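Help! Submission page says 'invalid entity' but I think these are all valid:
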Amino acid sequence: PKMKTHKGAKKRVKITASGKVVAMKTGKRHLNWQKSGKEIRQKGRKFVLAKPEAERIKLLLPYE
Amino acid sequence: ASEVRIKLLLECTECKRRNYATEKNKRNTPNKLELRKYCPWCRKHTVHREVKI
RNA sequence: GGGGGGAACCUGGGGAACUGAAACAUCUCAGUACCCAGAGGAGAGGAAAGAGAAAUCGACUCCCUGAGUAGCGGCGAGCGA
RNA sequence: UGGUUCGUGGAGCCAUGGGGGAAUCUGGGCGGACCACCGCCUAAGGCUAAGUACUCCGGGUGACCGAUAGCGCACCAGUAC
RNA sequence: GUAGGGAAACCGAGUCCGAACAGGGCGCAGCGGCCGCAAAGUCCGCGGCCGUGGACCCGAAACCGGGC
RNA sequence: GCUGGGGCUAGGAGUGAAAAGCUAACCGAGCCCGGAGAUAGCUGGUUCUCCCCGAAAUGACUUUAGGGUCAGCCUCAGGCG
RNA sequence: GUGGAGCCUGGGAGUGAGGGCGCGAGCGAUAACGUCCGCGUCCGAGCGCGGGAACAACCGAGACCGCCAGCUAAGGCCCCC
RNA sequence: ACCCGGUGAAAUUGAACUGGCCGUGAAGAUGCGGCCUACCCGUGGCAGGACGAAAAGACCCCGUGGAGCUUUACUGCAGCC
RNA sequence: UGAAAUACCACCCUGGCGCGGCUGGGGGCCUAACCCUCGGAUGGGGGGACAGCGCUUGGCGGGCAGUUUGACUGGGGCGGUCGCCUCCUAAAAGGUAACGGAGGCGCCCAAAGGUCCCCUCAGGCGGGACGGAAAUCCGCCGGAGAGCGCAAGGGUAGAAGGGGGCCUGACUGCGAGGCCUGCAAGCCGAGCAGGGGCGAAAGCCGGGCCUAGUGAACCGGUGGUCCCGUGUGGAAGGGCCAU
Ligand SMILES: [Mg+2]
Ligand SMILES: [Mg+2]
Ligand SMILES: [Mg+2]
Ligand SMILES: [Mg+2]
Ligand SMILES: [Mg+2]
Ligand SMILES: [Mg+2]
Ligand SMILES: [Mg+2]
Ligand SMILES: [Mg+2]
Ligand SMILES: [Mg+2]
Ligand SMILES: [Mg+2]
Ligand SMILES: [Mg+2]
Ligand SMILES: [Mg+2]
Ligand SMILES: [Mg+2]
Ligand SMILES: [Mg+2]
Ligand SMILES: [Mg+2]
Ligand SMILES: [Mg+2]
Ligand SMILES: [Mg+2]
Ligand SMILES: [Mg+2]
Ligand SMILES: [Mg+2]
Ligand SMILES: [Mg+2]
Ligand SMILES: [Mg+2]
Ligand SMILES: [Mg+2]
Ligand SMILES: [Mg+2]
Ligand SMILES: [Mg+2]
Ligand SMILES: [Mg+2]
Ligand SMILES: [Mg+2]
Ligand SMILES: [Mg+2]
Ligand SMILES: [Mg+2]
Ligand SMILES: [Mg+2]
Ligand SMILES: [Mg+2]
Ligand SMILES: [Mg+2]
Ligand SMILES: [Mg+2]
Ligand SMILES: [Mg+2]
Ligand SMILES: [Mg+2]
Ligand SMILES: [Mg+2]
Ligand SMILES: [Mg+2]
Ligand SMILES: [Mg+2]
Ligand SMILES: [Mg+2]
Ligand SMILES: [Mg+2]
Ligand SMILES: [Mg+2]
Ligand SMILES: [Mg+2]
Ligand SMILES: [Mg+2]
Ligand SMILES: [Mg+2]
Ligand SMILES: [Mg+2]
Ligand SMILES: [Mg+2]
Ligand SMILES: [Mg+2]
Ligand SMILES: [Mg+2]
Ligand SMILES: [Mg+2]
Ligand SMILES: [Mg+2]
Ligand SMILES: [Mg+2]
Ligand SMILES: [Mg+2]
Ligand SMILES: [Mg+2]
Ligand SMILES: [Mg+2]
Ligand SMILES: [Mg+2]
Ligand SMILES: [Mg+2]
Ligand SMILES: [Mg+2]
Ligand SMILES: [Mg+2]
Ligand SMILES: [Mg+2]
Ligand SMILES: [Mg+2]
Ligand SMILES: [Mg+2]
Ligand SMILES: [Mg+2]
Ligand SMILES: [Mg+2]
Ligand SMILES: [Mg+2]
Ligand SMILES: [Mg+2]
Ligand SMILES: [Mg+2]
Ligand SMILES: [Mg+2]
Ligand SMILES: [Mg+2]
Ligand SMILES: [Mg+2]
Ligand SMILES: [Mg+2]
Ligand SMILES: [Mg+2]
Ligand SMILES: [Mg+2]
Ligand SMILES: [Mg+2]
Ligand SMILES: [Mg+2]
Ligand SMILES: [Mg+2]
Ligand SMILES: [Mg+2]
Ligand SMILES: [Mg+2]
Ligand SMILES: [Mg+2]
Ligand SMILES: [Mg+2]
Ligand SMILES: [Mg+2]
Ligand SMILES: [Mg+2]
Ligand SMILES: [Mg+2]
Ligand SMILES: [Mg+2]
Ligand SMILES: [Mg+2]
Ligand SMILES: [Mg+2]
Ligand SMILES: [Mg+2]
Ligand SMILES: [Mg+2]
Ligand SMILES: [Mg+2]
Ligand SMILES: [Mg+2]
Ligand SMILES: [Mg+2]
Ligand SMILES: [Mg+2]
Ligand SMILES: [Mg+2]
Ligand SMILES: [Mg+2]
Ligand SMILES: [Mg+2]
Ligand SMILES: [Mg+2]
Ligand SMILES: [Mg+2]
Ligand SMILES: [Mg+2]
Ligand SMILES: [Mg+2]
Ligand SMILES: [Mg+2]
Ligand SMILES: [Mg+2]
Ligand SMILES: [Mg+2]
Ligand SMILES: [Mg+2]
Ligand SMILES: [Mg+2]
Ligand SMILES: [Mg+2]
Ligand SMILES: [Mg+2]
Ligand SMILES: [Mg+2]
Ligand SMILES: [Mg+2]
Ligand SMILES: [Mg+2]
Ligand SMILES: [Mg+2]
Ligand SMILES: [Mg+2]
Ligand SMILES: [Mg+2]
Ligand SMILES: [Mg+2]
Ligand SMILES: [Mg+2]
Ligand SMILES: [Mg+2]
Ligand SMILES: [Mg+2]
Ligand SMILES: [Mg+2]
Ligand SMILES: [Mg+2]
Ligand SMILES: [Mg+2]
Ligand SMILES: [Mg+2]
Ligand SMILES: [Mg+2]
Ligand SMILES: [Mg+2]
Ligand SMILES: [Mg+2]
Ligand SMILES: [Mg+2]
Ligand SMILES: [Mg+2]
Ligand SMILES: [Mg+2]
Ligand SMILES: [Mg+2]
Ligand SMILES: [Mg+2]
Ligand SMILES: [Mg+2]
Ligand SMILES: [Mg+2]
Ligand SMILES: [Mg+2]
Ligand SMILES: [Mg+2]
Ligand SMILES: [Mg+2]
Ligand SMILES: [Mg+2]
Ligand SMILES: [Mg+2]
Ligand SMILES: [Mg+2]
Ligand SMILES: [Mg+2]
Ligand SMILES: [Mg+2]
Ligand SMILES: [Mg+2]
Ligand SMILES: [Mg+2]
Ligand SMILES: [Mg+2]
Ligand SMILES: [Mg+2]
Ligand SMILES: [Mg+2]
Ligand SMILES: [Mg+2]
Ligand SMILES: [Mg+2]
Ligand SMILES: [Mg+2]
Ligand SMILES: [Mg+2]
Ligand SMILES: [Mg+2]
Ligand SMILES: [Mg+2]
Ligand SMILES: [Mg+2]
Ligand SMILES: [Mg+2]
Ligand SMILES: [Mg+2]
Ligand SMILES: [Mg+2]
Ligand SMILES: [Mg+2]
Ligand SMILES: [Mg+2]
Ligand SMILES: [Mg+2]
Ligand SMILES: [Mg+2]
Ligand SMILES: [Mg+2]
Ligand SMILES: [Mg+2]
Ligand SMILES: [Mg+2]
Ligand SMILES: [Mg+2]
Ligand SMILES: [Mg+2]
Ligand SMILES: [Mg+2]
Ligand SMILES: [Mg+2]
Ligand SMILES: [Mg+2]
Ligand SMILES: [Mg+2]
Ligand SMILES: [Mg+2]
Ligand SMILES: [Mg+2]
Ligand SMILES: [Mg+2]
Ligand SMILES: [Mg+2]
Ligand SMILES: [Mg+2]
Ligand SMILES: [Mg+2]
Ligand SMILES: [Mg+2]
Ligand SMILES: [Mg+2]
Ligand SMILES: [Mg+2]
Ligand SMILES: [Mg+2]
Ligand SMILES: [Mg+2]
Ligand SMILES: [Mg+2]
Ligand SMILES: [Mg+2]
Ligand SMILES: [Mg+2]
Ligand SMILES: [Mg+2]
Ligand SMILES: [Mg+2]
Ligand SMILES: [Mg+2]
Ligand SMILES: [Mg+2]
Ligand SMILES: [Mg+2]
Ligand SMILES: [Mg+2]
Ligand SMILES: [Mg+2]
Ligand SMILES: [Mg+2]
Ligand SMILES: [Mg+2]
Ligand SMILES: [Mg+2]
Ligand SMILES: [Mg+2]
Ligand SMILES: [Mg+2]
Ligand SMILES: [Mg+2]
Ligand SMILES: [Mg+2]
Ligand SMILES: [Mg+2]
Ligand SMILES: [Mg+2]
Ligand SMILES: [Mg+2]
Ligand SMILES: [Mg+2]
Ligand SMILES: [Mg+2]
Ligand SMILES: [Mg+2]
Ligand SMILES: [Mg+2]
Ligand SMILES: [Mg+2]
Ligand SMILES: [Mg+2]
Ligand SMILES: [Mg+2]
Ligand SMILES: [Mg+2]
Ligand SMILES: [Mg+2]
Ligand SMILES: [Mg+2]
Ligand SMILES: [Mg+2]
Ligand SMILES: [Mg+2]
Ligand SMILES: [Mg+2]
Ligand SMILES: [Mg+2]
Ligand SMILES: [Mg+2]
Ligand SMILES: [Mg+2]
Ligand SMILES: [Mg+2]
Ligand SMILES: [Mg+2]
Ligand SMILES: [Mg+2]
Ligand SMILES: [Mg+2]
Ligand SMILES: [Mg+2]
Ligand SMILES: [Mg+2]
Ligand SMILES: [Mg+2]
Ligand SMILES: [Mg+2]
Ligand SMILES: [Mg+2]
Ligand SMILES: [Mg+2]
Ligand SMILES: [Mg+2]
Ligand SMILES: [Mg+2]
Ligand SMILES: [Mg+2]
Ligand SMILES: [Mg+2]
Ligand SMILES: [Mg+2]
Ligand SMILES: [Mg+2]
Ligand SMILES: [Mg+2]
Ligand SMILES: [Mg+2]
Ligand SMILES: [Mg+2]
Ligand SMILES: [Mg+2]
Ligand SMILES: [Mg+2]
Ligand SMILES: [Mg+2]
Ligand SMILES: [Mg+2]
Ligand SMILES: [Mg+2]
Ligand SMILES: [Mg+2]
Ligand SMILES: [Mg+2]
Ligand SMILES: [Zn+2]
């Protein structure tokens, strides 16, 4: 039958207008007290997934 | 961090929002830390006081 | 008047496990397999104490679509209006 | 407790095994906890063709098989064993 | 498919973070002489491969249900 | 004590002077059919011809170590030059 | 330096049990057809060809086909030859 | 048992035109090298070899395989309070 | 006369007692539900509102059920080990293995952090009450053998070492360009803006001489934000920022 959308990917990730895959940076969920302001701030941004992993994730997003 | 060396928040004394997280040795520095830090809501420097985490 | 029978099909009463989660228990397989009661040439359902925002529609059943959407999910595998 | 996409979730709706237990339109249920406003609808009685499902049966047709194939069986087969 | 950006309200060739008109992330722009030709995209055929199904074929020991 | 005839108790159940013995010639859980094409990261097997190119047995991570994901290395199409 | 060189994008992989040898180390016993890395090589996939008596990886050499033609390589020229 | 008349199986079986030694070879060679021995074909016998036959090793390990059993493993259920 | 002042009647307190309403525990008894029994049964006898049984609460519970019970490994088990830092092995770039050789980390510091100013060690010889191998003092020599919180290495006095003053940059919003690299991470970072610290200034400051001192998601807590709010206004509950 028809492919189902993966909802783990759907809640973590977005396909950009040109087909990149953008996720939130990792490692500021907790244990932040001794992390420099440089660490929290740059972790507050989105990053572009490396091409191997991105193409895998978009295949999980068949109807985006 | 240990039991003696705690994590703590810094609260802007004026608008009351916590802006910073740091640590102290509450056996070496048993008093509440008071530190002038930049507050981004007041957008000026203000005394910050240690507040439980 | 009933009883018993009928290839599947139907409704109700009960209802697994392997399997999948690359272990496993919630979850899945699945209300499936199976057992049982009953129906009939079909059975069910059906004429709003409905839907849900359309200032609206207007019983039920069935197909397409809405839509793998909304959501649900050891927010896992997956499930899914 | 079940049903629903809803696995306790802010968890309503529908159903109900237990306990408590009303009212009759100035009555009641619902619109996803709850409350107000606003609107929808009339529970606790029953029936109701057609569209839908299936293929023991009959017929029509195959870029279906052609006796190790096609039904297990083209033949005295659910037989001999 | 023709618009993206943002958790979202929302704004929109931009938008988000931000106090910023700062910086940055993710975005925005055919060929020949009105015609042709090419093209975004989309539809159908074909083919490789992937997902869901037993999914290349044969093989367990076992588990479960109902009967004998 | 042995034995004929007539009976009763069965599958997580019987029966057992106890050996996990026996329950229709293999019982640490009978047989038949069904779930079912269970699952098997394992072993085996995998069918005409010609032409071109042509590996790897490493790294990282892995309840991972004879299995995987990504990278490395092969090949084809388009492009660059 | 125009090469089955390189680079960019995308399709299809397979491989992730290696093994001998040379040299450089660790482990072992200045043991092992031992073990573990590094550089290289060949076998793997060249168990096709000459030599080494025979013999994957030592020497010679990369087999498109055909010839009762010639030159060489390693190795050989007393006879088997 | 053997011979004659009658009837007449079997597992196994890649094909076989199936010798010894010393070597070599995946490390135990009828099958490769060197040497040696050897006319063709049967019958009764013996069991050293064909790593002889039989049984996809029970030991051992490996599989995120199974099953029986245990318990102050986990988590449920019956039963009891 | 005090804070309030008196005869008199309310309404309500305090705490106590009695008749009660209506219940909550105990206790005794009754019979008729319910159970057992009785030639006799619309009854008699015994038990008795208990027991049984329905719903629900918590507990005990291998009697049964579903399962789990790691890997590396000179076979497996047993032992050892598993992430991170330092050195060597490592073949003079980088990287490189073994159950090869040796050590450390799972912290710490409110100064041990920023900046300005000043200062310079260990050690040896000689000299000096208590005073020694070594306490403190004076002289001479003494490039770093000391020190830098803790392993080791690198680095270092032309300071990163010692002392003092003022401080909180142990910033907020970002971030050109790189190191490293399978991914995900990890690392360094000038520069611009805000508001500051020190300095006359040039400037420095986004913790610490440096390399260990650590943990992706999911689920949830807490502060803030005021973005979503299931017809509407709120609310429930989420999202975002911080932890
Ligand atoms: Mg998810
Ligand atoms: Mg994060
Ligand atoms: Mg986390
Ligand atoms: Mg957070
Ligand atoms: Mg949080
Ligand atoms: Mg730090
Ligand atoms: Mg910081
Ligand atoms: Mg901070
Ligand atoms: Mg921020
Ligand atoms: Mg769509
Ligand atoms: Mg779209
Ligand atoms: Mg009947
Ligand atoms: Mg009938
Ligand atoms: Mg049913
Ligand atoms: Mg019934
Ligand atoms: Mg049912
Ligand atoms: Mg049923
Ligand atoms: Mg059952
Ligand atoms: Mg299951
Ligand atoms: Mg299955
Ligand atoms: Mg699956
Ligand atoms: Mg399945
Ligand atoms: Mg499983
Ligand atoms: Mg599995
Ligand atoms: Mg298992
Ligand atoms: Mg399961
Ligand atoms: Mg189900
Ligand atoms: Mg069926
Ligand atoms: Mg019937
Ligand atoms: Mg009909
Ligand atoms: Mg009807
Ligand atoms: Mg009516
Ligand atoms: Mg649509
Ligand atoms: Mg379901
Ligand atoms: Mg539908
Ligand atoms: Mg209820
Ligand atoms: Mg439910
Ligand atoms: Mg529910
Ligand atoms: Mg929820
Ligand atoms: Mg619900
Ligand atoms: Mg309501
Ligand atoms: Mg009820
Ligand atoms: Mg109800
Ligand atoms: Mg009314
Ligand atoms: Mg009312
Ligand atoms: Mg109702
Ligand atoms: Mg409603
Ligand atoms: Mg109303
Ligand atoms: Mg209504
Ligand atoms: Mg009806
Ligand atoms: Mg009609
Ligand atoms: Mg009808
Ligand atoms: Mg009909
Ligand atoms: Mg029909
Ligand atoms: Mg027919
Ligand atoms: Mg024909
Ligand atoms: Mg025939
Ligand atoms: Mg036939
Ligand atoms: Mg024929
Ligand atoms: Mg027939
Ligand atoms: Mg016959
Ligand atoms: Mg969006
Ligand atoms: Mg921009
Ligand atoms: Mg086209
Ligand atoms: Mg593919
Ligand atoms: Mg199958
Ligand atoms: Mg299938
Ligand atoms: Mg198949
Ligand atoms: Mg397939
Ligand atoms: Mg069996
Ligand atoms: Mg099972
Ligand atoms: Mg089982
Ligand atoms: Mg069982
Ligand atoms: Mg049965
Ligand atoms: Mg007798
Ligand atoms: Mg007898
Ligand atoms: Mg008998
Ligand atoms: Mg008998
Ligand atoms: Mg029996
Ligand atoms: Mg018995
Ligand atoms: Mg039986
Ligand atoms: Mg059984
Ligand atoms: Mg059974
Ligand atoms: Mg048992
Ligand atoms: Mg006996
Ligand atoms: Mg039998
Ligand atoms: Mg038997
Ligand atoms: Mg069993
Ligand atoms: Mg069983
Ligand atoms: Mg038997
Ligand atoms: Mg059956
Ligand atoms: Mg099945
Ligand atoms: Mg099978
Ligand atoms: Mg299995
Ligand atoms: Mg080639
Ligand atoms: Mg490897
Ligand atoms: Mg990894
Ligand atoms: Mg691991
Ligand atoms: Mg590993
Ligand atoms: Mg495996
Ligand atoms: Mg790959
Ligand atoms: Mg290449
Ligand atoms: Mg190439
Ligand atoms: Mg090309
Ligand atoms: Mg070229
Ligand atoms: Mg090439
Ligand atoms: Mg490629
Ligand atoms: Mg292909
Ligand atoms: Mg291809
Ligand atoms: Mg492989
Ligand atoms: Mg692969
Ligand atoms: Mg491997
Ligand atoms: Mg390997
Ligand atoms: Mg190997
Ligand atoms: Mg190896
Ligand atoms: Mg190797
Ligand atoms: Mg190699
Ligand atoms: Mg070697
Ligand atoms: Mg040499
Ligand atoms: Mg060597
Ligand atoms: Mg040497
Ligand atoms: Mg070495
Ligand atoms: Mg070796
Ligand atoms: Mg050697
Ligand atoms: Mg060696
Ligand atoms: Mg090699
Ligand atoms: Mg191979
Ligand atoms: Mg060669
Ligand atoms: Mg080659
Ligand atoms: Mg060869
Ligand atoms: Mg070969
Ligand atoms: Mg050769
Ligand atoms: Mg040769
Ligand atoms: Mg020769
Ligand atoms: Mg050779
Ligand atoms: Mg060899
Ligand atoms: Mg060769
Ligand atoms: Mg060639
Ligand atoms: Mg010549
Ligand atoms: Mg020569
Ligand atoms: Mg010679
Ligand atoms: Mg000659
Ligand atoms: Mg004779
Ligand atoms: Mg004879
Ligand atoms: Mg022959
Ligand atoms: Mg012969
Ligand atoms: Mg040899
Ligand atoms: Mg030999
Ligand atoms: Mg011979
Ligand atoms: Mg020969
Ligand atoms: Mg030969
Ligand atoms: Mg020979
Ligand atoms: Mg020979
Ligand atoms: Mg010969
Ligand atoms: Mg001889
Ligand atoms: Mg003979
Ligand atoms: Mg013999
Ligand atoms: Mg014999
Ligand atoms: Mg023998
Ligand atoms: Mg032999
Ligand atoms: Mg033998
Ligand atoms: Mg054999
Ligand atoms: Mg046997
Ligand atoms: Mg087998
Ligand atoms: Mg075997
Ligand atoms: Mg075996
Ligand atoms: Mg066997
Ligand atoms: Mg065993
Ligand atoms: Mg073993
Ligand atoms: Mg095992
Ligand atoms: Mg495991
Ligand atoms: Mg495994
Ligand atoms: Mg298992
Ligand atoms: Mg088991
Ligand atoms: Mg069992
Ligand atoms: Mg008892
Ligand atoms: Mg009494
Ligand atoms: Mg009585
Ligand atoms: Mg009495
Ligand atoms: Mg009494
Ligand atoms: Mg009671
Ligand atoms: Mg209760
Ligand atoms: Mg209970
Ligand atoms: Mg237990
Ligand atoms: Mg058990
Ligand atoms: Mg299971
Ligand atoms: Mg486990
Ligand atoms: Mg485990
Ligand atoms: Mg293992
Ligand atoms: Mg192991
Ligand atoms: Mg191993
Ligand atoms: Mg080893
Ligand atoms: Mg060994
Ligand atoms: Mg070994
Ligand atoms: Mg060992
Ligand atoms: Mg152990
Ligand atoms: Mg470690
Ligand atoms: Mg080195
Ligand atoms: Mg190195
Ligand atoms: Mg090096
Ligand atoms: Mg080197
Ligand atoms: Mg590098
Ligand atoms: Mg070890
Ligand atoms: Mg240690
Ligand atoms: Mg100080
Ligand atoms: Mg310092
Ligand atoms: Mg001195
Ligand atoms: Mg002195
Ligand atoms: Mg002295
Ligand atoms: Mg003295
Ligand atoms: Mg030093
Ligand atoms: Mg230390
Ligand atoms: Mg200072
Ligand atoms: Mg000041
Ligand atoms: Mg960057
Ligand atoms: Mg990276
Ligand atoms: Mg790090
Ligand atoms: Mg870190
Ligand atoms: Mg500034
Ligand atoms: Mg300034
Ligand atoms: Mg300034
Ligand atoms: Mg000043
Ligand atoms: Mg800076
Ligand atoms: Mg420091
Ligand atoms: Mg540090
Ligand atoms: Mg999870
Ligand atoms: Mg949360
Ligand atoms: Mg909030
Ligand atoms: Mg609302
Ligand atoms: Mg709002
Ligand atoms: Mg509502
Ligand atoms: Mg209001
Ligand atoms: Mg509002
Ligand atoms: Mg409010
Ligand atoms: Mg809120
Ligand atoms: Mg905002
Ligand atoms: Mg945060
Ligand atoms: Zn403030």
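Support: the input was valid. A stray whitespace character was the problem, and the output above is from the cleaned input. Residues 51-59 of chain A form the longest helix (9 residues).
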